[PDB]
Design an enzyme around this catalytic site. Structure first.
Site, PDB file in Angstrom:
ATOM      1  CE1 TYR B  90      -4.211   1.235  -0.083  1.00  0.00           C
ATOM      2  CE2 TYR B  90      -3.602   2.562   1.819  1.00  0.00           C
ATOM      3  CZ  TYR B  90      -4.478   2.268   0.791  1.00  0.00           C
ATOM      4  OH  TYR B  90      -5.623   3.004   0.619  1.00  0.00           O
ATOM      5  NE  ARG B 143      -9.857  14.482  -3.232  1.00  0.00           N
ATOM      6  CZ  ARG B 143      -9.408  15.268  -2.256  1.00  0.00           C
ATOM      7  NH1 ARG B 143      -8.796  16.415  -2.553  1.00  0.00           N
ATOM      8  NH2 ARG B 143      -9.570  14.910  -0.984  1.00  0.00           N
ATOM      9  CE  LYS B 161      -7.723   2.492   2.577  1.00  0.00           C
ATOM     10  NZ  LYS B 161      -8.676   2.958   1.549  1.00  0.00           N
ATOM     11  CD  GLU B 233     -10.325   5.086   0.398  1.00  0.00           C
ATOM     12  OE1 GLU B 233      -9.940   5.988  -0.370  1.00  0.00           O
ATOM     13  OE2 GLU B 233     -10.067   5.054   1.625  1.00  0.00           O
ATOM     14  CG  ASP B 234      -8.082   7.142  -3.443  1.00  0.00           C
ATOM     15  OD1 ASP B 234      -7.731   8.037  -2.649  1.00  0.00           O
ATOM     16  OD2 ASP B 234      -7.406   6.100  -3.588  1.00  0.00           O
ATOM     17  CG  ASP B 256     -10.053   5.277   5.198  1.00  0.00           C
ATOM     18  OD1 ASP B 256     -10.241   5.269   6.437  1.00  0.00           O
ATOM     19  OD2 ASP B 256      -8.921   5.127   4.688  1.00  0.00           O
ATOM     20  CG  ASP B 257     -10.660   9.141   0.928  1.00  0.00           C
ATOM     21  OD1 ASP B 257      -9.923   8.257   1.406  1.00  0.00           O
ATOM     22  OD2 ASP B 257     -10.816   9.302  -0.303  1.00  0.00           O
ATOM     23  CG  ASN B 399       0.305  12.716   4.439  1.00  0.00           C
ATOM     24  OD1 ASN B 399       0.966  13.119   5.406  1.00  0.00           O
ATOM     25  ND2 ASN B 399      -0.827  12.030   4.577  1.00  0.00           N
TER      26      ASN B 399
HETATM   27  N1  LIG Z   1      -4.363  10.003   7.876  1.00  0.00           N
HETATM   28  C1  LIG Z   1      -3.617  11.012   7.425  1.00  0.00           C
HETATM   29  O1  LIG Z   1      -2.431  11.178   7.742  1.00  0.00           O
HETATM   30  C2  LIG Z   1      -4.340  11.990   6.449  1.00  0.00           C
HETATM   31  C3  LIG Z   1      -5.693  11.763   6.082  1.00  0.00           C
HETATM   32  C4  LIG Z   1      -6.366  12.629   5.183  1.00  0.00           C
HETATM   33  C5  LIG Z   1      -5.691  13.731   4.638  1.00  0.00           C
HETATM   34  N2  LIG Z   1      -4.312  13.982   4.998  1.00  0.00           N
HETATM   35  C6  LIG Z   1      -3.546  15.134   4.398  1.00  0.00           C
HETATM   36  O2  LIG Z   1      -4.350  16.374   4.322  1.00  0.00           O
HETATM   37  C7  LIG Z   1      -3.965  17.078   3.103  1.00  0.00           C
HETATM   38  C8  LIG Z   1      -5.195  17.729   2.475  1.00  0.00           C
HETATM   39  O3  LIG Z   1      -6.234  16.751   2.270  1.00  0.00           O
HETATM   40  P1  LIG Z   1      -7.777  17.213   2.070  1.00  0.00           P
HETATM   41  O4  LIG Z   1      -8.590  15.997   1.851  1.00  0.00           O
HETATM   42  O5  LIG Z   1      -8.171  18.133   3.159  1.00  0.00           O
HETATM   43  O6  LIG Z   1      -7.746  18.063   0.734  1.00  0.00           O
HETATM   44  P2  LIG Z   1      -8.665  19.218   0.151  1.00  0.00           P
HETATM   45  O7  LIG Z   1      -8.145  19.644  -1.172  1.00  0.00           O
HETATM   46  O8  LIG Z   1     -10.075  18.787   0.250  1.00  0.00           O
HETATM   47  O9  LIG Z   1      -8.403  20.380   1.211  1.00  0.00           O
HETATM   48  C9  LIG Z   1      -7.214  21.171   1.165  1.00  0.00           C
HETATM   49  C10 LIG Z   1      -7.528  22.530   1.753  1.00  0.00           C
HETATM   50  O10 LIG Z   1      -6.301  23.279   1.981  1.00  0.00           O
HETATM   51  C11 LIG Z   1      -6.469  24.618   1.441  1.00  0.00           C
HETATM   52  N3  LIG Z   1      -5.198  25.095   0.858  1.00  0.00           N
HETATM   53  C12 LIG Z   1      -4.621  24.691  -0.327  1.00  0.00           C
HETATM   54  N4  LIG Z   1      -3.446  25.332  -0.478  1.00  0.00           N
HETATM   55  C13 LIG Z   1      -3.348  26.084   0.581  1.00  0.00           C
HETATM   56  C14 LIG Z   1      -2.261  26.897   0.788  1.00  0.00           C
HETATM   57  N5  LIG Z   1      -1.263  26.967  -0.104  1.00  0.00           N
HETATM   58  N6  LIG Z   1      -2.262  27.648   1.945  1.00  0.00           N
HETATM   59  C15 LIG Z   1      -3.317  27.561   2.826  1.00  0.00           C
HETATM   60  N7  LIG Z   1      -4.374  26.730   2.561  1.00  0.00           N
HETATM   61  C16 LIG Z   1      -4.377  25.977   1.416  1.00  0.00           C
HETATM   62  C17 LIG Z   1      -7.571  24.535   0.428  1.00  0.00           C
HETATM   63  O11 LIG Z   1      -8.380  25.719   0.443  1.00  0.00           O
HETATM   64  C18 LIG Z   1      -8.384  23.337   0.811  1.00  0.00           C
HETATM   65  O12 LIG Z   1      -9.601  23.760   1.464  1.00  0.00           O
HETATM   66  C19 LIG Z   1      -3.335  16.044   2.169  1.00  0.00           C
HETATM   67  O13 LIG Z   1      -2.094  16.519   1.617  1.00  0.00           O
HETATM   68  C20 LIG Z   1      -3.110  14.800   3.007  1.00  0.00           C
HETATM   69  O14 LIG Z   1      -1.748  14.409   3.002  1.00  0.00           O
HETATM   70  C21 LIG Z   1      -3.650  13.103   5.908  1.00  0.00           C
HETATM   71 LU   LIG Z   2      -7.708   7.372   0.480  1.00  0.00          LU
END
Ligand SMILES: NC(=O)c1ccc[n+]([C@@H]2O[C@H](COP(=O)([O-])OP(=O)(O)OC[C@H]3O[C@@H](n4cnc5c(N)ncnc54)[C@H](O)[C@@H]3O)[C@@H](O)[C@H]2O)c1
Ligand SMILES: [Lu+3]
Ligand SMILES: NC(=O)c1ccc[n+]([C@@H]2O[C@H](COP(=O)([O-])OP(=O)(O)OC[C@H]3O[C@@H](n4cnc5c(N)ncnc54)[C@H](O)[C@@H]3O)[C@@H](O)[C@H]2O)c1
Ligand SMILES: NC(=O)c1ccc[n+]([C@@H]2O[C@H](COP(=O)([O-])OP(=O)(O)OC[C@H]3O[C@@H](n4cnc5c(N)ncnc54)[C@H](O)[C@@H]3O)[C@@H](O)[C@H]2O)c1
Ligand SMILES: NC(=O)c1ccc[n+]([C@@H]2O[C@H](COP(=O)([O-])OP(=O)(O)OC[C@H]3O[C@@H](n4cnc5c(N)ncnc54)[C@H](O)[C@@H]3O)[C@@H](O)[C@H]2O)c1
Ligand SMILES: NC(=O)c1ccc[n+]([C@@H]2O[C@H](COP(=O)([O-])OP(=O)(O)OC[C@H]3O[C@@H](n4cnc5c(N)ncnc54)[C@H](O)[C@@H]3O)[C@@H](O)[C@H]2O)c1
Ligand SMILES: NC(=O)c1ccc[n+]([C@@H]2O[C@H](COP(=O)([O-])OP(=O)(O)OC[C@H]3O[C@@H](n4cnc5c(N)ncnc54)[C@H](O)[C@@H]3O)[C@@H](O)[C@H]2O)c1
Ligand SMILES: [Lu+3]
Ligand SMILES: [Lu+3]
Lengths: 551, 551, 551
Positions: B90, B143, B161, B233-234, B256-257, B399
């Site tokens: 994964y 996505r 998964k 998912e995604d 999950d997301d 990430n």
């Molecule tokens: N389990 C985990 O560790 C886990 C789980 C889910 C998501 N994540 C991390 O969260 C991050 C975002 O995921 P998401 O689902 O929220 O995405 P998303 O695109 O739905 O949300 C991203 C948000 O960040 C904002 N943004 C973008 N660029 C920005 C910037 N340059 N400055 C300030 N704000 C900014 C955007 O307006 C948006 O609302 C991912 O990179 C992912 O690695 C980690």
């Molecule tokens: Lu996912």
């Protein structure tokens, strides 16, 4: 395979006769009752049940059922009383069954190639489960016995013979294959029966017809080899006679209704002379009709007459034919086909009008009944031949015991048992006014085709020549014990049709080899033990896997 | 079933570990090397080869091989080195493999439903070999992680998964089914990729897409049961949120997301306070972004604030969100969606321009970096939080390690270690000047979904409540140890992810029963044993029949 | 069989190449990505992939898998680029893989008849899923190439070998069966290898050994007939020569490392003389060895000499052999075997203490490096022969390219291109100071065994005589172009091994035929189109059932 599909396949299923081990190993435990039968118990319960059976058709429908249930069992019981069962499984009961076919229908049995399938026979031919096939019986039901057109209702025939193939010869049940061809029909009664099982339409005698046959021959050969045995049965003379001329030299085919018959007839005539001892040249054989059966024997005769240093021409000039339209002679008003021409000798000074009339004028040493028109071998007829010959030869093969040209009794009783008789149908011994019992002779084809079949297959012979049937004849008769002769019967007791056929096998496989017509390599030294070794047995087989501890 | 197919199906095959006796009784003798390996021996040959490998995606290829090869060996191997194989079978390597799907294809794996199949989904549904399927995982590839729209190349996730659902929870493979729905893609490259293996066209957003999912939704619950779990998912935020709103109470589904993510965060968010101990009511949480992963959590937070005695309103009022377009405030120019309004509070006297500016203006207790925009959690921003708070909470989950809002060092070091930091990216401990190794934890969703998946299953739960995620969260957190605390991790070592999820399964199923959300009867007494009882094995089983002597 | 099994079988599977119609009808929709590929795209994905590969064994592995997942394709790809793939699927990469077998192992590939299965082989034979086998390869892994006793690690040879039978001649795969027989092993290392996949015991040599061979020979023939082709392989000389003389007459057996090798050489030597023209009589031939190859070669030569108006005696008398124990002369000190006598002539006045030494005293026309000891055809040994003969013949068959007795360079140069070179290992063209480039001819057996194998089968040639190998050489040799002769090759481009082999086969059939040893009937008037027909293909075949409306 494993499990219930084992019990589903007749070729495998052993019923209760399945061993506890298998029953376990095979994942059967609990699918069968806690009882482990033998093949003797199973068999017992059979007769134990066939007895309570009334009509012979009812018994047919019963036995024919253990065929698509348990291959071995079915066939074990078969030989168990092969003599008595044969007439149910085959003639005449099957003619009944064949007529009833479509009503008494239950599970299907052979292969069906219809004219509506033209252009794809192969794939069809490919639908057949069996891998190795060696025997093929085919009919287009046009002349199902004395029942005439019976369309696909005739498939009952292929089914029957193939059974005998195995029953008295030992040919593998798998290696066989009954086939029925549907090109439509002419029996109106059939064309209006909601129970009919074929294309509802008048026959097809167009070019489409042959091509279809052609396509199937190749399809069969293509699929199973060029040496594969193809027996033509119940056809329309004309076709049945031309489809032979045609493919005989192209494939491994033979038509019993013709070759198969002439074989047994001869055997008869033969054994007769073995007791008559009358110098060929003086013989005079007269036929009560020029049809299929006739022309068929007529030549295997000439053929063997000739084999005795006689010119085909003078040979056949010793053969006379009398069909419905009177006597077969040169220039007559009626018509005469090409096959007939030879036996149509230039008109004799005075022309008879009665078969009885003829007998005199010609004065034949022999007389054969093959007109299937009932009892025409009048007492007069008999009694006349009975005079002109110190030991006349009369053969009434017409069937059933309804069509014979006469009876065993009128035969011997009207000749002082000075005659030699043979019936195509069954007939009882005959004890006369001096405490003399004469057990007659029934010439069934079951005497030949199965034996000839086993030989040609185990020999990889490529074609079947007439000399084979001519040789087959001898083989047969040459099985008649002097006492059998004493008894007066000109055909080995139908109780041992097996060995007889098994013997006929040998002698034919040998003959084949000698004339170098057999390709099976390498030639064996002991054909006897050769053949006798290759027979198929009903004796169950263990289905257990070959386990074994490893040192 | 028997023969090679035993060797052909991965579920059955076990290679040279097939016992001599099974070989013998199963008819596999002489089909396998005379050697008889054990599972370990085999699992060894693996690790030996894996060694000589270089690139991870190379391994992932090798390993994913033993999958479609030997079901029972593949997994043993997985939970054999789980902490180390996890990121191969994964993420992240799987991200790699998805972008490479097509060039690295060898054999199919899951179920493919395409809008070209609309109307017949069911039939498709009916072709999946397996009979019993409890857990499903759908994706439309829109996505795929940070790789975005990947068309059918995303089918690489449902598989990855499920491997965890099975390796971590202990779920029956033949009960899970990775599904991949195709509605075109919008990736031109793929669109031009000659090895792309999906429909060549733009992503369909019409009404049809909605119906498809439906047809599929119902088509699966039909064939398998409406109690059958389906994991989204995604997917694309907009849809992944409504579909979640829609089928939520209609089927046994979750995502999950969103759901998955939310729980894990809070887990940390509680493990922290746990050492911090700061009267909820004085809490002030701030998000660096407002998308999916933020609102997904934002509410898991609430729920628990409100569980601690707050009201829906007073809780959220303790939460602020700052996305790219600045601070999320009542009346702001940029757009605010219905799923944001709640957290969009009234403009504070001064409106900040920078996240760091907002940092002061608001004075949060907890800071969440979820924008996936790299290092925006500036040393200043760090230093500020660290000042205003004697125990600041910083969470950089973005990430990969790059998009990360920061790094443990710049957190711990820039706080003397007065910060409770958690990252969604792997970070090794950090020994400072005084000499203090701190092990910052990571928040893999792999902690959640399996164990919950596990429970929801065997509990025959009909619907997944968020309350289960909130609950779940506690479960995981409460796995922690004072030492794990003193170490610095708010997350338990990935090493024992086995027990970790299993243990969560229990505690959760319990919660389900008590709230009556569980429909699996009879309700055991000792749940612990119950589950530990119902976990699939990796160790071989027999196929050998049950043979025994009949006394 | 339909559904997943159909794609579970390497023989039936077509990957994304399954038409939509086959897909829907065979119940495969959804089970496959929604993309219908073409063999071309499939095979294309393979090279494009093989490229990124590096190690030669790696590629092997990669390609040997396509074999166990999709026949057609694998081969398609194969003959697609037969030249470059040949060495990977076979020598000299095969040995790399036999040595690593088990250390690489993924799925079984052929039959395995251990000595522990003694008394049961038949059943084991009966376990092979193929019903009509026609080609067989067997080996006891005692002398697998210059590697020696390799145990069941040697199974890889028959497998590989078989691939060429196909890839080169056009033999139906399902009709080929590679076999290995574990009787223990004398190589220690393996006996300590935890992965070794055979009988962890010393090589049994007692009577049990042969008996097993026999038990097998028939077992096979029993199930697949007698005419079934049985080529031996990589055995330990000793038995190789014996089992040869043995079953040679009672079966359709032969040995490639004896009859095959020979044929290639003489095909080289026949070529040479075509451009040398030196009336036999004045021919002198020495040999750098008297092991296996030597004798084989030697004889076929004698056979031909004989063919050209000579006498066995003088013939071989024109042949000498110098092994590692000095030269093979009468009464020498070393041990001369029976097969070696007819070439161990009576000592010439002065006796050579050196090959170079024997080169003068003998002053032979032809020379042959079959010692596999390395470069023993030194620049002196060369030049000497160069001097002695205006057109000297040098053949260094030793393999790999390390045992080569010399090289094309040290050959053509140290002779100004006056010699007739031919090596066993691979070598590319040579340009000299006078800008003269000469391609050196390689003599792989691949040039032979296929073509022949193909013939015997198709002709049902019950036995394989030596007059066929020799007759095979001629035929091969006759495939050389005069320009090809110009460049200087005595062997046609490996790049056209398909035709080569086919055309060799055609020529042989007519031979087998004309010499009355081909039994297949009827003998076809056109052998060309005949053979050229039954050649197997890599082009996929429809699975769709034959459907058609019924008028
Ligand atoms: N389990 C985990 O560790 C886990 C789980 C889910 C998501 N994540 C991390 O969260 C991050 C975002 O995921 P998401 O689902 O929220 O995405 P998303 O695109 O739905 O949300 C991203 C948000 O960040 C904002 N943004 C973008 N660029 C920005 C910037 N340059 N400055 C300030 N704000 C900014 C955007 O307006 C948006 O609302 C991912 O990179 C992912 O690695 C980690
Ligand atoms: Lu996912
Ligand atoms: N337990 C069993 O069912 C079992 C056991 C051993 C052999 N066999 C069968 O025996 C065959 C080998 O025989 P062979 O080649 O030595 O014989 P053969 O060459 O002497 O026989 C000539 C041909 O006739 C066929 N044949 C043999 N007996 C037959 C019969 N009684 N009825 C119909 N056709 C027959 C043969 O297949 C062969 O093609 C194999 O095909 C095998 O399937 C079956
Ligand atoms: N193995 C056997 O026992 C066996 C074999 C074949 C035929 N037969 C018998 O032979 C009879 C005829 O069969 P076939 O195949 O030769 O048929 P067929 O139609 O070929 O023969 C009929 C011939 O008999 C003639 N005929 C009919 N009625 C006549 C009459 N009333 N008077 C004079 N001549 C008459 C016709 O002119 C015709 O030439 C059948 O009854 C059948 O039972 C027996
Ligand atoms: N040797 C074997 O392969 C073996 C032996 C015994 C039972 N089983 C299987 O167990 C099933 C009976 O389950 P039960 O009623 O005792 O359980 P249960 O009532 O305790 O569990 C309730 C639900 O959870 C499912 N389930 C149980 N374990 C699961 C797992 N490990 N992964 C995914 N889903 C799981 C069950 O199918 C059931 O729908 C049977 O369908 C049978 O096929 C297999
Ligand atoms: N088609 C081909 O290209 C082909 C075919 C078969 C063999 N070969 C080659 O032939 C070589 C040997 O194979 P073989 O079948 O002859 O096996 P072998 O082991 O039977 O032959 C060895 C012979 O060479 C002699 N010998 C060993 N060391 C010697 C030395 N140091 N000096 C002089 N003579 C020595 C031995 O006495 C023995 O007679 C191998 O290197 C192999 O590559 C090539
Ligand atoms: N779509 C298909 O795969 C397909 C279609 C039609 C026929 N066939 C096969 O062709 C066979 C018919 O052969 P024939 O009677 O023309 O043969 P033949 O008598 O002309 O050839 C002599 C022998 O060589 C064998 N043979 C022919 N080609 C072979 C090959 N390429 N590889 C290995 N052995 C080969 C034959 O089985 C036969 O025993 C049938 O057994 C059938 O299974 C296959
Ligand atoms: Lu009839
Ligand atoms: Lu070899």
């Amino acid at each position: 395979e494993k499990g219930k599909p084992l019990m589903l396949n007749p070729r495998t299923n052993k019923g209760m006769a399945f061993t506890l081990q298998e029953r376990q190993m095979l994942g059967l435990q609990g699918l069968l009752p806690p009882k482990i039968e033998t093949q003797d118990i199973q068999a017992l319960r059979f007769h134990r049940n066939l007895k309570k059976m009334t009509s012979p058709l009812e018994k047919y429908i019963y036995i024919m059922g253990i065929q698509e249930r348990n291959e071995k069992l079915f066939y074990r019981i078969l030989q168990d009383d092969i003599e008595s069962l044969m007439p149910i499984v085959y003639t005449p009961t099957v003619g009944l069954a064949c007529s009833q076919y479509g009503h008494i229908f239950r599970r299907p049995k052979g292969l069906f190639i219809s004219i509506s399938d033209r252009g794809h026979v192969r794939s069809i031919v490919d639908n057949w489960p069996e891998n190795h096939v060696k025997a093929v019986v085919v009919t287009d039901g046009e002349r199902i016995l004395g029942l005439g057109d019976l369309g696909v209702y005739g498939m009952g025939i292929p089914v029957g013979k193939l059974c005998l193939y195995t029953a008295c010869a030992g040919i593998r049940p798998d290696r066989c294959l009954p086939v029925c061809i549907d090109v439509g029909t002419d029996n109106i009664a059939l064309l209006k029966d909601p129970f009919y099982m074929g294309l509802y339409q008048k026959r097809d005698r167009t070019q489409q017809y042959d091509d279809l046959i052609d396509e199937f021959m190749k399809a069969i050969t293509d699929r199973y080899g060029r040496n594969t045995l193809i027996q033509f049965e119940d056809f329309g003379n004309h076709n049945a006679f031309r489809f032979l001329r045609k493919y005989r030299e192209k494939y491994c085919t033979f038509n019993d209704d013709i070759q198969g018959t002439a074989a047994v007839a001869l055997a008869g005539l033969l054994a007769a002379q073995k007791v008559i001892s009358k110098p060929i040249s003086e013989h005079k054989i007269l036929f009560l009709g020029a049809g299929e059966a006739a022309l068929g024997i007529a030549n295997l005769i000439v053929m063997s007459m000739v084999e005795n240093g006689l010119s085909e021409q003078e040979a056949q000039k010793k053969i006379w034919m009398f069909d419905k339209y009177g006597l077969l002679v040169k220039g007559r008003k009626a018509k005469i086909d090409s096959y007939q021409e030879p036996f149509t000798h230039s008109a004799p000074e005075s022309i008879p009008d009665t078969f009885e009339d003829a007998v005199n004028i010609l004065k034949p040493s022999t007389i054969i009944g093959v007109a299937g028109a009932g009892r025409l071998f009048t007492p007069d007829v008999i009694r006349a031949m009975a005079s002109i010959n110190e030991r006349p030869v009369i053969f009434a093969l017409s069937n059933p015991t309804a069509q014979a040209e006469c009876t065993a009794e009128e035969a011997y009783t009207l000749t002082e048992g000075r005659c030699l008789f043979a019936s195509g149908s069954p007939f009882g011994p005959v004890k006369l006014t001096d405490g003399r019992v004469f057990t007659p002779g029934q010439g069934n084809n079951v005497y030949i085709f199965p034996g000839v079949a086993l030989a040609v297959i185990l020999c990889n012979t490529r074609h079947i020549s007439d000399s084979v049937f001519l040789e087959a004849a001898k083989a047969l008769t040459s099985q008649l014990t002097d006492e059998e002769l004493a008894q007066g019967r000109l055909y080995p007791p139908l109780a041992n049709i097996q060995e007889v056929s098994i013997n006929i096998a040998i002698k034919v496989t040998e003959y084949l080899y000698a004339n170098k017509m057999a390709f099976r390599y390498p030639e064996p030294e002991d054909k006897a033990k050769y053949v006798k070794e290759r027979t198929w047995r009903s004796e169950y087989d263990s289905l257990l896997p070959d386990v074994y501890e490893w040192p």
